[PDB]
Subunit: 243 residues, 2 copies
């Protein structure tokens, strides 16, 4: 039974989970096939073997299991157990993204912007990030705003870019809170507010910790704030130590 | 340019069904499984195209054969309700299971009921409880009231009235129109929870506010017979008897 084999996986009983998933009725379950591949891919209960993992990913992916064709596209991108191939990764990332897979839609948006494994398409890449944001991945909101802040595929509208930064700032994204705090400083798409800029750099330290400290250590050395010695400098350690 | 299938999906989400079919019916978009399922749904509702439940199942099948869980659910639902195809429960459980195996919440709610009652599949109490748990993990708030029934009746597990109440409380807070009735029953029956009349009436009200017909007929009998220590109100018991009346009106 496949359902009992998944409960054994949650209990880290990897050997007993493998036995239930190898049952003839469970071996035909794509969710069980993808889990068997994950065990060989990480070495849980067996030896780590990416080549055997891909054969189980392929079985479940050929049934249309989105989670599997994402794992298979990952093996093509990282070259684990197979030759690194970006054209084949996009082929499998697209199969999963068409089924509302959040991480796959993030992959599709990233590779379509850069042109890796597929033709560069700013129009289609913006569509992928919208679905990725709608399907859970809160990192997509900041990626969407860059299309409007730069005019890629759409008309350069700094006001629409801030709308997506705000949506990403509510849900706790460091990159979105970075752009929002920057929009409050340069008055891009939103009226200037020195207090709210600093307020969205502070919340950007609670959730995540990007290199807004390159701007933090720069304005204390601006925005209605008197130049602080300790501030303009203590922000540079966390900007250099994490580099 | 932009993708036709992706454009049609966001056009449907914008409630612009006429423009969506213009992009969905393009040859390249008709290969997308999500677009195929959306075409079938629009054929079912007659939005952007003439209504046709038989053509709807043709598009459901094209996407269900690609492994799209939504299409596998809609195709299985067409077999249960007989929409666009002759009714068949052994084919409904086949496509419900394919979708439920892919973490489809509404399909897992079907597998739990069909394995509890034994329709189309051999009855299994332990397997049915695991489906309802998955439906609760995947966002369907109706699963909590169904999970608690396993403990109120001792089906596959030990008869625990207390833990049944805890699931009714969870479903009641999630706004489920069915868990509030079972929770109000526990407050009145004092099963698995101490008796409370003023709190039983509250959940009986919220249950009817969500459209629970069984709660309305129980609430009308309380306002009429004067139960749970409150003044009899024949005027309000009529309002809950009339709004409990079900009628297969034809639009």
């Amino acid at each position: 039974n496949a359902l009992t084999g998944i409960e054994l996986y949650k209990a880290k009983k990897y050997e007993q989970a493998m036995t239930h998933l190898m049952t003839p009725d469970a071996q035909k379950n794509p969710a069980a096939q993808n889990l068997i591949g994950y065990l060989y891919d990480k070495g849980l209960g067996v030896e780590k073997n990416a080549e055997i993992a891909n054969q189980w990913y392929l079985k479940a992916a050929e049934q249309g299991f989105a989670k599997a064709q994402f794992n298979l596209g990952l093996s093509y991108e990282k070259g684990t157990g197979i030759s690194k191939n970006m054209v084949e990764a996009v082929k499998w990332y697209r199969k999963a993204a068409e089924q509302n897979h959040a991480k796959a839609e993030m992959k599709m948006g990233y590779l379509t912007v850069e042109g890796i494994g597929t033709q560069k398409n700013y129009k289609e890449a913006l569509q992928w990030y919208r679905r990725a944001a709608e399907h859970g991945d809160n990192r997509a909101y900041a990626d969407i705003g860059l299309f409007y802040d730069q005019g890629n595929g759409v008309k350069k509208d700094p006001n629409r870019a801030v709308q997506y930064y705000i949506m990403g700032a509510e849900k706790g994204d460091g990159e979105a809170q970075l752009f929002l705090a920057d929009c409050y400083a340069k008055a891009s798409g939103i009226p200037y507010d020195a207090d709210r800029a600093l307020y969205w750099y502070k919340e950007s330290a609670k959730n995540g910790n990007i290199t807004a400290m390159k701007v933090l250590s720069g304005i204390y050395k601006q925005l209605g704030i008197e130049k602080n010695p300790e501030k303009s400098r203590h922000w540079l350690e966390m900007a250099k130590q994490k580099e």
